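Help! Submission page says 'invalid entity' but I think these are all valid:
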Amino acid sequence: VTLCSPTEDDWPGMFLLAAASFTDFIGPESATAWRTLVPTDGAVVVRDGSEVVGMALYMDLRLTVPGEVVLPTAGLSFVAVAPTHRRRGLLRAMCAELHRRIADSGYPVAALHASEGGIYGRFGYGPATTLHELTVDRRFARFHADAPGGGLGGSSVRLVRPTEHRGEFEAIYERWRQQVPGGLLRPQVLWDELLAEAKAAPGGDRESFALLHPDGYALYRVDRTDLKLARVSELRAVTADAHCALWRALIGLDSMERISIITHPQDPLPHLLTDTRLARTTWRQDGLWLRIMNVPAALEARGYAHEVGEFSTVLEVSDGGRFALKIGDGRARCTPTDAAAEIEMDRDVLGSLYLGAHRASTLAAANRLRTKDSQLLRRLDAAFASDVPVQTAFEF
Amino acid sequence: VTLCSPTEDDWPGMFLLAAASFTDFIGPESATAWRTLVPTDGAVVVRDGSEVVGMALYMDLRLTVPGEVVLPTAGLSFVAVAPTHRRRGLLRAMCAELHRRIADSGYPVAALHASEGGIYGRFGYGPATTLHELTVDRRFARFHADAPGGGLGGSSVRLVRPTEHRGEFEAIYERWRQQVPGGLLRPQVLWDELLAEAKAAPGGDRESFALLHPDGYALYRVDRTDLKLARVSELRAVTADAHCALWRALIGLDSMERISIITHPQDPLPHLLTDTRLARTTWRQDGLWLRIMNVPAALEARGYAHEVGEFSTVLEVSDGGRFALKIGDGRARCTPTDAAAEIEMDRDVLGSLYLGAHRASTLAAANRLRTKDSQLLRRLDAAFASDVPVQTAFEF
Amino acid sequence: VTLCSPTEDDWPGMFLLAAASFTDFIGPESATAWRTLVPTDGAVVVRDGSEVVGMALYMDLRLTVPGEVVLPTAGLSFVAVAPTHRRRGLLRAMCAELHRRIADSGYPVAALHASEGGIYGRFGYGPATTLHELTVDRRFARFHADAPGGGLGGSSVRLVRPTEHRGEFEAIYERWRQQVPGGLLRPQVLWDELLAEAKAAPGGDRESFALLHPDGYALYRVDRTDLKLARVSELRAVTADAHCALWRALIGLDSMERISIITHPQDPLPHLLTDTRLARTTWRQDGLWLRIMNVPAALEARGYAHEVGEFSTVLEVSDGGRFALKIGDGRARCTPTDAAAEIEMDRDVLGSLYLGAHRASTLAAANRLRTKDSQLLRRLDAAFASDVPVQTAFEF
Amino acid sequence: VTLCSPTEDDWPGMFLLAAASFTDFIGPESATAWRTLVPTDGAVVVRDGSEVVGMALYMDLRLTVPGEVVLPTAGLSFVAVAPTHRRRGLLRAMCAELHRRIADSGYPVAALHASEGGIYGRFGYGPATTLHELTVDRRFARFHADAPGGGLGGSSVRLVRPTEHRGEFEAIYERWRQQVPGGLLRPQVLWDELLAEAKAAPGGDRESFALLHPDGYALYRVDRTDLKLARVSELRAVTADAHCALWRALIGLDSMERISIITHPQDPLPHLLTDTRLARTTWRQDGLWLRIMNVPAALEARGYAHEVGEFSTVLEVSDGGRFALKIGDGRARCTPTDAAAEIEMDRDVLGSLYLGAHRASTLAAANRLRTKDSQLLRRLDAAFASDVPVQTAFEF
Ligand SMILES: Nc1nc(SCCCN2CCCCC2)nc2sc3c(c12)CCC3
Ligand SMILES: Nc1nc(SCCCN2CCCCC2)nc2sc3c(c12)CCC3
Ligand SMILES: Nc1nc(SCCCN2CCCCC2)nc2sc3c(c12)CCC3
Ligand SMILES: Nc1nc(SCCCN2CCCCC2)nc2sc3c(c12)CCC3
């Protein structure tokens, strides 16, 4: 067992390990598209003597963070150890090698989507966004008087075939991802994939329809087995008007009993209805996980709340450095120091604060984040908070 | 049909309407205890010609709000219209009469627990706290290295009969409710009720056990039908140590597969585990609903974030007044003005911001809260936010 | 934390730990009856500083083993560690102390019923009997021509109130337990308990009825929630005639769709029907677990198959001795030796072979039982096998 | 209605009756393969006046019986009566005709797989092997210290595409079926069928993967609807090492919660784990059914336990002959006699004892097997028992 970059002849073995390791694997001729996002030296394989018994890679991604700043981001994915080589330390070896390469390439952060919430904390990854399934019983749903877009005169929302309005979706998503923390550049090849999932499958998923507004879209389909449920796969809205308009259209799906969507905890949909409770939260999970690769480069890159006054402190990341952190005017300066640490935390905890989805107060309550001054805790809390709520772009 | 204060001879008719209207009604000799919390002229009945076809009352409560300030609070409850007198405007008449009496008595706020999330918005009530059911699969649960109270040496947590350690629970709850927004004074008679629910029922609920720490307690019981589920009815912890210690004890219930609890969205339990995901959010609802009875008295009474700098603005509540609002140094001054409104909202929306559980940004996104300056929105957001997270005390 | 025999004043604390540790606990005034089966120095408690945080005891039992031989048996039960004192090594301390006392008292074997199949292997306990739930769809059930007791003329089976025919049940059970491996003497106090479970509970279990034959009985009751299911709590038959007669009566319960019973894997009921498949096996578990306390005393006490010819060998139990074992004429001689071991196994594996419910071939296939001669394996297999099939008496 | 051998022009009508009679029918161009195993005069059809309203056939099979002896075996299958011709005695006519031809061809035994356990007893078929579904919760599964193949150094097990390692599977199965009672020669055409079921179906079964050891294999696939369940379709192991190695690989399927397999009651898997209970028995049924066509030829062909001493007796099969049976040195001599019968049974009961999966004691308890000497019962029991446990090869 040795660690190597895969050659063209390894990929068939990687696809076999993929098929056996991921229930949701989309076959090799669709994995061709994701491969384009893997840089030269983005992948490691472990061979036995030889078949692939281990693999991991990263993709080149652009992640939006608070202050509408776009970071280069190594997206970890396609991580797998053969069932025949468990408890052999292959993951520890592969992750160490990719993190070496990710750091040496100058990525300030790495990101992934977890298959279990227990594996990735020990490698410096912290859950950074929260998924929120809302299911609406749309038979009872009435919009509030105060809701926009309920006036006698035209609807701006159209029902369309997704495949025929790609450019409009691309345009809206591009505007969306640039102004929202958690947003990812979605390259051409993943739009090719998204619109091939939109056509009906023989004895699989049903036809996907689109609701198109000048400033937003929604892709939805009826569930395979529950024919009274509509699953909103993706809703992107740039303006509050577009968000409300699109929800009026979805509550107008009179053949459905329930609309379900995976959104963020600050989704305003409940407040659009006369009865907040009709939009039930039916499921919550960690979305994107973040590993801060370079602490000073990442803390300096994002914006901070203009509301909190200027303040200084010393932050220690366990096996990650000690830094004089000064925050004011929504910018941070982060420099090396040997001064006494006022605030200590593991690198994963920093990942979790970074997009401003978890409050420092909460992590401190669990002792994930040590300090002896609670004034500094309130300040971190307010500084790291995000004006624009954190959303999740797409699974990779 | 006329509106009257009930006399001693009306209560049997009220109890009949209660039994027919509330599935969870606890019989008349236990309703005797709650009656003590109803002031003279706290109740209205509607008689037909005569049996009770309508009733509503308020109880005298002390609600803790941000800045560890305790408000007198009218707690609405025992609201019911006979199934024979629907769409007759009896609720509108009864609520109007109680709100007249509540206001004239000098209560700055009123509060209730909703049976539906659609009834109470139009009477000025806004959902103000969020309930969060966490279910833990305790077979997989491992505490983090960073977690307190996992060191060789004594446990401070004891397993006890609830009935034999009342004074200790009372002491801990009193300390808890005084330092947490949403906290309610729990009077003697509701401790009498809480410990009568703690004994096993013939073909009903099972025996309740207590986990007692110097600085916290947990009441739990095994579910009636699911014998592998433990329901934590109530966990109160004053210190992070007490909260962690009590959870180590609950994960130690080796005969159970799952521990469920109703807590708040900022509960640190997920962050105590190596796997955040093992604490699944299985259910979310509006907890306490708030009606601000006197806008200037309530905005002046609570504390605000010291982090946001001093700022002034003009707030209009629909049919509720217009006020020059100046906030700085965590105090607010709120005075009458006829100046142009910068910020507008219905009274219910104010109820929802008041305990700092909903962000103004979120309500603004839904157009529940109108302004043309987004800088002022960020400021409201930060000012009204609560350092100590908002919890729910007990249903009334 | 120290290990002590409990005094009369400890038992209230033990009952508290019991109530919190066992979902099926029957309250203290019924635990009074089982207490009579606990000898002086049969119990250990661990106190903290003081409440009971740990307890274990054994009861004096008479277990029937192959060759209709009755062994004195320490029955372990009432084992519990407080949820506040997990991973503290209290079980290891308590089990060590009881095993010291059990051995020094001259018990050749100890036995228990497991709450998990993973705890008790490391303390020398092997699963020794197998439980088998058969559910019959009695609407389709027809007895075979070859079945006894289907002839024109009287039925010998009567439907009776259990409480009125105690002596007859006692008589039949006494005959049953003396001729069946796994049989236990059931003392007077556990008959007092068995017939108090036979009366209907308010919002609990339904009335128990009895089917009484001269040479067997069946206790059954309709399920709480499934009113088309009859649960046979206990069927004891001395003669094949009695077993068949009692099943004709149970298939005659025309208001029921299904009869369920927990029996042994060799129960002949399937072979009584024209359709073997109508008696579905719906559930299987380990019944009684056995720890051989004195290897030579236990191997010498039981009978062996007369069919296998005389043979000698050397058996090593890990940390349990090495013995020259000679078996012939259904007796064994077991003496100390330092000669080379032909057969090796952990003490738990011996427990599992002892009642002849597990085949040595099967344990050898799993490498629980090492030898290099497969002829000796066939011989062990045949010797240790039981003519009369192994059954489970009652849970303790 | 008359009984005829089908001509080439009957098969389309037979396939229609098949499609309407068997839910699991695989279409006509796959039935082409099984047809090759049907000898000339292996099939009967009943025509009405003309469409096929009745059919039955046998296939030429080689069944392994105790003593690693291989019998020619008529495998009954494709038995069907049109729903329009029930209770017309067509099955009785067709079975009589095939049994005439099977006997006259010199097959000592016939075998089938039942669609109901109630049809086939009256035609002389006895259930002879037992199926056992084990489901493992693989999250908790830990192998015992004593288990083979858990040492630092290479795994001998590989994850492979089934279609690319046919010869290896064939080799291992050939070795397996020759040394195990219940084993069947699997001809080339049924390997062609087995590896066409191994590829993913559009809106059907998922891709099948293989775990390959030098001395064993496992075919598994994720369930259609339960994506956390892996179904092991087939596990064949020649050595205990291979069996353990393959189970370590299956417990290493970390994306699955549960591994299910259909195996035999003596499968050693439970004993490989620290917790026997984690391998739950979730389902049991009759596997292969056996009809002894020639009693003396079949009793003479198989081996018997060498452990039981030489003994003689007289066996009567109802309408099947009376025989002087002498068993010693694991051989039997079976000759015609008119001497008094010591042991009587229906032919089906003999089928059930023949592979040594049912104990004579058990069948005697049900009066399926009459004798007045219980010493002779113990001897039959031991003689007919099988050293190597009885397994089920494949459904036909
Ligand atoms: N990165 C990829 N993603 C996907 S689908 C996203 C599934 C999300 N998971 C992600 C993990 C668990 C939760 C949910 N497919 C492929 S194929 C292929 C790649 C790749 C990389 C290069 C070859
Ligand atoms: N206030 C009371 N509460 C209760 S139990 C709390 C149930 C919570 N509900 C509250 C509403 C819906 C959700 C859940 N019982 C009684 S009796 C009695 C009173 C009263 C007042 C005076 C006579
Ligand atoms: N030995 C006892 N048994 C029972 S009920 C049997 C339950 C079976 N379990 C046993 C374990 C798990 C499976 C199923 N109750 C009591 S009270 C009391 C004793 C005792 C001892 C002295 C005070
Ligand atoms: N013998 C065959 N088997 C199968 S699939 C095995 C199904 C098992 N059943 C068997 C019975 C019920 C339980 C389960 N298919 C065919 S097609 C075709 C034949 C045949 C014979 C000649 C044309």
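Support: the input was valid. A stray whitespace character was the problem, and the output above is from the cleaned input. The domain at 1-128+287-291 of chain B is CATH 3.40.630.30 (Aminopeptidase).
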